[PDB]
């Protein structure tokens, strides 16, 4: 795996969906991982060609997503304006 930095600019949203979280309902890639996983990406949205299903988000605008709950991850990402700098784990 690898740590990739991507910048997704809200227009007006980031354009992707996430699954997982600590105590959450899991993810379709690695069930033994309570991390946050990109699950669906809008074909021509702000995250298109930048994020892919399976991406594990471990940092968003300097905020670590390790041991984060889903409700908190969604809350944080909706709070950010403009661009969100992500650090993702990609195969």
């Amino acid at each position: 795996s690898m740590e990739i930095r991507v910048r997704v600019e809200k227009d007006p949203e980031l354009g992707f969906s996430i699954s997982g979280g600590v105590g959450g309902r899991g993810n379709p890639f690695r069930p033994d991982d309570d991390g946050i996983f990109v699950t669906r990406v809008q074909p021509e949205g702000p995250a298109s060609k930048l994020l892919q299903p399976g991406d594990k988000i471990i940092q968003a605008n300097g905020y670590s997503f390790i041991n984060i709950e889903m409700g908190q991850a969604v809350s944080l990402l909706k709070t950010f304006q403009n661009t969100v700098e992500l650090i993702i784990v990609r195969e």
Binding site: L14, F16, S17, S19, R25, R40, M70, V74, K78
Partner: peptide, 5 residues
Amino acid sequence: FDFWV
């Protein structure tokens, strides 16, 4: 069960 951001 995914959430759109």
